[PDB]
Amino acid sequence: SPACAGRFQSPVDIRPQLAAFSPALRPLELLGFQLPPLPELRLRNNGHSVQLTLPPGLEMALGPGREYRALQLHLHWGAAGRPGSEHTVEGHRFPAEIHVVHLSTAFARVDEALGRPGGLAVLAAFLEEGPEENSAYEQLLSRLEEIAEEGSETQVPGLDISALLPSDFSRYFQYEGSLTTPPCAQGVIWTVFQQTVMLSAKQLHTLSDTLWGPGDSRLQLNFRATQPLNGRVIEASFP
Amino acid sequence: SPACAGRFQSPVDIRPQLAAFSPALRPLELLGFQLPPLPELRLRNNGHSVQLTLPPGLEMALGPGREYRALQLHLHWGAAGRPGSEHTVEGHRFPAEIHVVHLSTAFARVDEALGRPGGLAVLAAFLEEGPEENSAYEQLLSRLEEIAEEGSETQVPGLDISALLPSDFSRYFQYEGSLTTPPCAQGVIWTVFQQTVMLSAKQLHTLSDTLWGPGDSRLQLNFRATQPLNGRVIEASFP
Numbered sequence: 131s132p133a134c135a136g137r138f139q140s141p142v143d144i145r146p147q148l149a150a151f152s153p154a155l156r157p158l159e160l161l162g163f164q165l166p167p168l169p170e171l172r173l174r175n176n177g178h179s180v181q182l183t184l185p186p187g188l189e190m191a192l193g194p195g196r197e198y199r200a201l202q203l204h205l206h207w208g209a210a211g212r213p214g215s216e217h218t219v220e221g222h223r224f225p226a227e228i229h230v231v232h233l234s235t236a237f238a239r240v241d242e243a244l245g246r247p248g249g250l251a252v253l254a255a256f257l258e259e260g261p262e263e264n265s266a267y268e269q270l271l272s273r274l275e276e277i278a279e280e281g282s283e284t285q286v287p288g289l290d291i292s293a294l295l296p297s298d299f300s301r302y303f304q305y306e307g308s309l310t311t312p313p314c315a316q317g318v319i320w321t322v323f324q325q326t327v328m329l330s331a332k333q334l335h336t337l338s339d340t341l342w343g344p345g346d347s348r349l350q351l352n353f354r355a356t357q358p359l360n361g362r363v364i365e366a367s368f369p
Numbered sequence: 370s371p372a373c374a375g376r377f378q379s380p381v382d383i384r385p386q387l388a389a390f391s392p393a394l395r396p397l398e399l400l401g402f403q404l405p406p407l408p409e410l411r412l413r414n415n416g417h418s419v420q421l422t423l424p425p426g427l428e429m430a431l432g433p434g435r436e437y438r439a440l441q442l443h444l445h446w447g448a449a450g451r452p453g454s455e456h457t458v459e460g461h462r463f464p465a466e467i468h469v470v471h472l473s474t475a476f477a478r479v480d481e482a483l484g485r486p487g488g489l490a491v492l493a494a495f496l497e498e499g500p501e502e503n504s505a506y507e508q509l510l511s512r513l514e515e516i517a518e519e520g521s522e523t524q525v526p527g528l529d530i531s532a533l534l535p536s537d538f539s540r541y542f543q544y545e546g547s548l549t550t551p552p553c554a555q556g557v558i559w560t561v562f563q564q565t566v567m568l569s570a571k572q573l574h575t576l577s578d579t580l581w582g583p584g585d586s587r588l589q590l591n592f593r594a595t596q597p598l599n600g601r602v603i604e605a606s607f608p
């Protein structure tokens with residue numbers, strides 16, 4: 131895919147000292163993320179990541195008049211004693227990263243949004259080790275064994291999707307970039323939370339050690355190398 | 370259209386003390402705007418404004434990878450002793466306003482771009498009274514009497530469109546709003562130059578007094594009322 135050779139790709143190394151403070155960046159707003167248990171959602175090992183397909187009615191705004199609907203979420207992760215976030219901060223790679231991918235309400239389908247400015251928006255948070263079992267994450271992680279095989283899927287009860295994200299929606303970096311998988315189309319608005327989410331050591335081990343990918347290989351280290359900013363300026367919602 | 374009653378319409382009152390400075394807003398880039406004398410350009414009285422069709426090749430960027438092509442320019446103006454700008458600054462209405470309308474390179478057609486975020490971008494500058502005659506604007510103003518009649522049109526020599534704009538391309542306000550005429554589509558990026566351009570009192574009179582609209586009416590005061598921000602924050606490219 132030729133867009134994988136674009137000048138403005140993701141992910142990137144975030145250098146907060148070079149980030150631009152912009153007070154137009156208000157707290158993110160999420161609506162409908164607190165799901166009932168039924169209907170169930172589909173959790174799939176696609177051989178490259180674990181992805182959770184989201185139902186209609188999850189609305190996200192980056193600001194007034196900047197409205198999106200959530201499509202899916204997926205994870206990026208490393209391996210035993212090796213971090214696997216996609217984004218880095220000052221060259222630091224975090225253990226894992228969650229991405230929640232959204233479609234602008236001006237478009238009915240992803241294929242019309244691809245490459246259009248602000249057509250797609252991704253919410254990204256780093257996952258780090260904390261002392262406690264994260265109960266929202268446990269609902270997904272406890273099902274990975276069921277989908278160990280490449281191309282397998284299982285149904286899971288609806289949960290509070292917003293509980294997979296940090297509680298602080300006010301402090302984030304934002305920049306324009308790309309999908310990180312072919313076709314790497316540009317125009318994607320990336321939002322990366324400052325606050326991280328905490329999983330237990332056991333949870334992080336389940337995530338990195340359970341799933342299999344193409345041809346008898348463990349699905350691990352499933353992150354793209356850092357791409358140059360190439361003159362883009364990362365914005366921050368805080369000085 | 371009911372879209373004229375949408376929440377994120379244009380024009381607006383700019384309040385510079387409430388604008389958000391974002392250092393990410395780089396100088397505008399306008400290439401290919403210095404047109405040769407041939408081919409000639411269509412200038413047209415549509416009954417609502419005077420419009421100049423622009424050729425292919427006028428490239429405009431609002432930031433890295435956010436590129437546009439100019440389609441047309443048109444003007445908004447008052448009457449004798451009555452200002453007719455669309456935007457206001459702290460309640461002050463300027464004598465007139467120029468709009469240069471552009472299409473995102475991510476969209477092949479205007480009709481696909483209408484209602485999509487960033488599909489269209491308009492460059493807007495205030496016209497004020499100064500002591501000198503303005504050479505750039507004379508090229509257009511001297512041609513108005515030939516098209517005084519609703520629906521009439523004429524061909525004009527190519528001109529340097531960029532010469533119609535203010536001096537410092539690094540100093541502007543920017544927000545997302547709408548077309549200021551039906552269909553009032555949202556998702557339009559408005560960039561409003563901080564500095565103005567100056568015309569003579571005679572030129573201003575030529576602009577406001579020469580053209581005829583529907584009925585046997587003068588074509589005057591062709592500006593929409595100020596619309597609420599509804600929580601939108603206007604950005605500024607300077608502290």
Ligand SMILES: CS(=O)(=O)c1c(N[C@H]2CC[C@@H](O)CC2)c(F)c(S(N)(=O)=O)c(F)c1N[C@H]1CC[C@@H](O)CC1
Binds near residue numbers: 252352
């Ligand atoms: C196809 S996908 O859901 O897994 C996907 C990924 N997956 C990558 C995991 C790690 C890599 O080693 C290979 C594949 C991804 F990273 C982005 S990302 N990081 O750009 O957000 C995605 F958006 C989607 N899915 C997209 C969005 C839905 C749309 O239909 C196109 C594909």
Ligand SMILES: CS(=O)(=O)c1c(N[C@H]2CC[C@H](O)CC2)c(F)c(S(N)(=O)=O)c(F)c1N[C@H]1CC[C@@H](O)CC1
Binds near residue numbers: 468548
């Ligand atoms: C009627 S018009 O074309 O002169 C016009 C345009 N042109 C657009 C029309 C819709 C799109 O399909 C292509 C571009 C425009 F962009 C704005 S604006 N301000 O939104 O940029 C206008 F105000 C006017 N004309 C108006 C008509 C009513 C009159 O009172 C003021 C001028």
Ligand SMILES: [Zn+2]
Binds near residue numbers: 204229310
């Ligand atoms: Zn991803």
Ligand SMILES: [Zn+2]
Binds near residue numbers: 549
């Ligand atoms: Zn206009």
